[PDB]
Design a binder for this molecule. Structure first.
Ligand SMILES: Cc1nc(Nc2ncc(C(=O)Nc3c(C)cccc3Cl)s2)cc(N2CCN(CCO)CC2)n1
Ligand SMILES: CCCCCCCCO[C@@H]1O[C@H](CO)[C@@H](O)[C@H](O)[C@H]1O
Length: 333
């Protein structure tokens, strides 16, 4: 039943892992991650030892959250769990949690290299992002922090969504709006897509307020219909005092780009989050003609997020985490 574990010192703690995982090699330091080779599967994997997983109520809930989330994600364009383990033989000894994923070799900073991608290559990368987003959103989950560094790719350009840092952020998050919808991630995708087509950051704001300034120069100041939906007295009054800027014509901003790409960008980067295109709708858009397949753009099982409202003791989060470790089933090889 239980695999045989071995001990090895790695970034100044004692890691303890099943024999199947060979040649651990630190690559990052919440938790440290080593690259490794999984002899059972012939896969190169990332093994993450969680740091201080049950040191406080907050740590324990965070551990449980991360485990719950990774266990739920089962989709080609989203990072999944290959394995989860502990050296512990019972709940009473349970102090350590290790998570295992595919070892991703690069992210979308490394692929762009600040040089333009071809339009065919942007189609394939954005398609995959949207395919992953459809899945995530169908589980009633919002990513909230999509950016090139959270987008990992292999050598065949197969992409997985993972989880300056303000450049890809929807204006309503910059404003602390608090009732975010799923199209915040769509905003992020438009920013990424722009950058891939042009080789340049769309909105490289220097500071917080500068980020909003650059955003408004592209998409115009709020229209009459948007203004009706703003409950904040301070926001309305400040917005009403700005010199009204015209939304720019994206066709005369993204010069020589596929006009289908431009049309899609217009539908993603609408100031009004209620009027942004959804991921499912973006997949049906003619820009993705050569990739779109309704038979193979799957949705997720319902994801039970009720734990998030709960205030439980360290030992209760720990036992729930231990239940999740014990129930884990490896994906089909
Ligand atoms: C930090 C790092 N990650 C790499 N790949 C990763 N794949 C999966 C990872 C991972 O974190 N998964 C994961 C997640 C996402 C959540 C929970 C649990 C887990 Cl386990 S991290 C590669 C890499 N390289 C450094 C630079 N190069 C040397 C240059 O000569 C080689 C490549 N560096
Ligand atoms: C000065 C910069 C103006 C930014 C305008 C923010 C537009 C965001 O769009 C708004 O998103 C809210 C948050 O989810 C929704 O509740 C509103 O219905 C929607 O119109």
């Amino acid at each position: 039943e239980r695999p045989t574990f071995y001990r090895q010192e790695l970034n100044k703690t004692i890691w303890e892992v099943p024999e199947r995982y060979q040649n651990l090699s630190p690559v990052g330091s919440y938790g440290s991650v080593c690259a490794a080779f999984d002899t059972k599967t012939g896969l190169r994997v990332a093994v993450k030892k969680l740091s201080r997983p049950f040191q406080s109520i907050i740590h324990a809930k965070r551990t449980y959250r991360e485990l719950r989330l990774l266990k739920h994600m089962k989709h080609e364009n989203v990072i999944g769990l290959l394995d989860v383990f502990t050296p512990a033989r019972s709940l009473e000894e349970f102090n350590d949690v290790y998570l295992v994923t595919h070892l991703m070799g690069a992210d979308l900073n490394n692929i762009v290299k600040c040089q333009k991608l071809t339009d065919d290559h942007v189609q394939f990368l954005i398609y995959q992002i949207l395919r992953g987003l459809k899945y995530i959103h169908s589980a009633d989950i919002i990513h909230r922090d999509l950016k090139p560094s959270n987008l990992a790719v292999n050598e065949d350009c197969e992409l997985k969504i993972l989880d300056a840092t303000r450049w890809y952020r929807a204006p309503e998050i910059m404003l602390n709006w608090m009732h975010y919808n799923q199209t915040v991630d769509i905003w992020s995708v438009g920013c990424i897509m722009a950058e891939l087509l042009t080789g340049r950051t769309l909105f490289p704001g220097t500071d917080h307020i500068d980020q909003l300034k650059l955003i408004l120069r592209l998409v115009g100041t709020p229209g009459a219909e948007l203004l009706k939906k703003i409950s904040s007295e301070s926001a309305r009054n400040y917005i009403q005092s700005l010199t009204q800027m015209p939304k720019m014509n994206f066709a005369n901003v993204f010069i020589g780009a596929n006009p289908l790409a431009v049309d899609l960008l217009e539908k993603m980067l609408v100031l009004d989050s209620d009027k942004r295109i959804t991921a499912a709708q973006a997949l049906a858009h003619a820009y993705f003609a050569q990739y779109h397949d309704p038979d193979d753009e799957p949705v997720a099982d319902p994801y039970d997020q009720s734990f998030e409202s709960r205030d439980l003791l360290i030992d209760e989060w720990k036992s729930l985490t231990y239940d999740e470790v014990i129930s884990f089933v490896p994906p089909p090889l």
